[PDB]
Design an enzyme around this catalytic site. Structure first.
Site, PDB file in Angstrom:
ATOM      1  N   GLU A 224     -54.494  19.137   8.698  1.00 50.78           N
ATOM      2  CA  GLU A 224     -55.880  19.379   8.305  1.00 50.78           C
ATOM      3  C   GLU A 224     -56.743  19.915   9.443  1.00 50.78           C
ATOM      4  O   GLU A 224     -57.599  19.190   9.964  1.00 50.78           O
ATOM      5  CB  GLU A 224     -56.490  18.090   7.748  1.00 50.78           C
ATOM      6  CG  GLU A 224     -55.787  17.593   6.496  1.00 50.78           C
ATOM      7  CD  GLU A 224     -56.301  16.252   6.012  1.00 50.78           C
ATOM      8  OE1 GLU A 224     -57.119  15.630   6.723  1.00 50.78           O
ATOM      9  OE2 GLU A 224     -55.885  15.818   4.917  1.00 50.78           O
TER      10      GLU A 224
ATOM     11  N   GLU B 153     -49.990  16.386   1.170  1.00 51.53           N
ATOM     12  CA  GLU B 153     -50.643  15.113   0.906  1.00 51.53           C
ATOM     13  C   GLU B 153     -51.350  15.149  -0.439  1.00 51.53           C
ATOM     14  O   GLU B 153     -51.991  16.144  -0.790  1.00 51.53           O
ATOM     15  CB  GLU B 153     -51.667  14.754   1.992  1.00 51.53           C
ATOM     16  CG  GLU B 153     -51.095  14.526   3.376  1.00 51.53           C
ATOM     17  CD  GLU B 153     -52.141  14.022   4.347  1.00 51.53           C
ATOM     18  OE1 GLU B 153     -53.228  13.612   3.886  1.00 51.53           O
ATOM     19  OE2 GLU B 153     -51.883  14.042   5.569  1.00 51.53           O
TER      20      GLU B 153
END
Ligand SMILES: [Br-]
Ligand SMILES: [Br-]
Length: 357
Positions: free
Chosen positions: A164, A282
């Protein structure tokens, strides 16, 4: 999956015999924390956990780590050596070696994910793959060290270059250009092991459009990742439900009808247009907020190839790893309950139809 490394062809991941395969696994985090090893070994045995993963139909473990893991001499902490006697006296990296080794014996593959620089819990507070002490230079060289270590181990199939990078930009050429940084680390890793999949997550915003951290892959259309070895790039969005954040695309009734177009707009187009494979690194939920179920129902259907979520769908559908195997995630929970043993069957009902068989 057939033994040996993998490759990409269009939106497909292929095994060593040219057969399309699918990565359907879980996140086992902990090695990015101060303990330096994946969580749960204070009560479970590491082989029992991997066997239980495989027994639930999963075939991939995404293993987050921190940059600090590669340079610390501290012994691992928390491990119950009565239950894990084979891990006694092993270093943190040697425990990772043991986990990877057994996972390959159990028919599973491993994706390494640079989760953060310092030892910590979750996403880097920086939103970046570096900080004032952990440089991008060391981040690149560290990926080269890992590639060397597992160069002869096809259990380690891919490198998730950074988790991320929501404060990076897709393009621009500067120090915070995530596309440039990913191409630099990808080529550096591929120069040591050219058989690695190079897993590139998205950023956070692109030309004014904000999405889940890691799930903003809109920049690929006009500026895709280009590496010096072909057929290695796998794009990895992250996607989460309303309980994690009350995003504007969850608000108002009939929001679920527009979720397929939303998935496609941010990352799903890459698979649908046969540009590159999609592997969502995820996604998770406790299935308490009713909007969570609407999201997971639409997501699992979209990943299966039902891009409009109507019911209609020799290729394989999208790859994925669930967040998380661990229970000790505050917002999403995991596959295991808090006792680190009991399976949450209500989540497995969603996942079993999209596992690789
Ligand atoms: Br053991
Ligand atoms: Br920590």
């Amino acid at each position: 999956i057939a033994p040996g490394f993998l490759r990409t062809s269009g939106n497909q991941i292929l095994d060593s015999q040219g057969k399309p395969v699918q990565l359907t696994g879980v996140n086992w985090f902990g090695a990015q924390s101060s303990n330096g090893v994946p969580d749960g070994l204070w009560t479970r045995n590491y082989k029992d956990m991997i066997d239980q993963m495989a027994g639930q139909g999963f075939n991939t473990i995404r293993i987050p780590y921190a940059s600090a893991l590669l340079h610390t001499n501290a012994a691992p902490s928390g491990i119950n050596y009565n239950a894990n006697p084979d891990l006694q006296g092993l270093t943190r990296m040697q425990v990772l070696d043991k986990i990877i080794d057994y996972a390959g014996q159990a028919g599973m593959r491993v994706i390494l994910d640079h989760h953060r620089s310092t030892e910590g819990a979750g996403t880097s507070e920086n939103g970046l793959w570096y900080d004032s002490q952990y440089t991008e230079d060391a981040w690149v060289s560290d990926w080269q060290t890992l590639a060397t270590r597992y160069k002869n181990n096809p259990t380690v199939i891919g490198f998730d270059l950074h988790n991320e990078p929501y404060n990076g930009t897709w393009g621009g050429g500067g120090a915070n250009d995530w596309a440039r940084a990913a191409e630099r680390a990808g080529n550096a890793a591929l120069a040591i092991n050219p058989n690695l999949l190079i897993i590139v997550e998205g950023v956070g915003s692109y030309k004014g459009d904000n999405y889940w951290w890691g799930g903003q892959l809109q920049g690929v259309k006009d500026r895709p990742i280009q590496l010096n070895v072909a057929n290695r790039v796998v794009y990895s969005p992250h996607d989460y439900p309303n309980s994690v954040w009350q995003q504007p695309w969850f608000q108002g009734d009939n929001f679920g009808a527009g979720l397929p177009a939303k998935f496609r707009s941010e990352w799903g187009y890459i698979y649908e247009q046969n540009i590159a494979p999609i592997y969502i690194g995820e996604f998770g939920t406790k299935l308490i907020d009713p909007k969570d179920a609407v999201w997971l129902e639409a997501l699992t259907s979209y990943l299966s190839g039902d891009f409009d979520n109507n019911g209609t769908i020799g290729t394989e559908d999208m790859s994925w790893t669930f967040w998380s195997w661990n229970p000790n995630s505050g917002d999403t929970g995991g596959i295991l309950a808090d006792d680190w043993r009991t399976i949450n069957q209500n989540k497995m009902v969603y996942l079993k139809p999209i596992q690789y068989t």
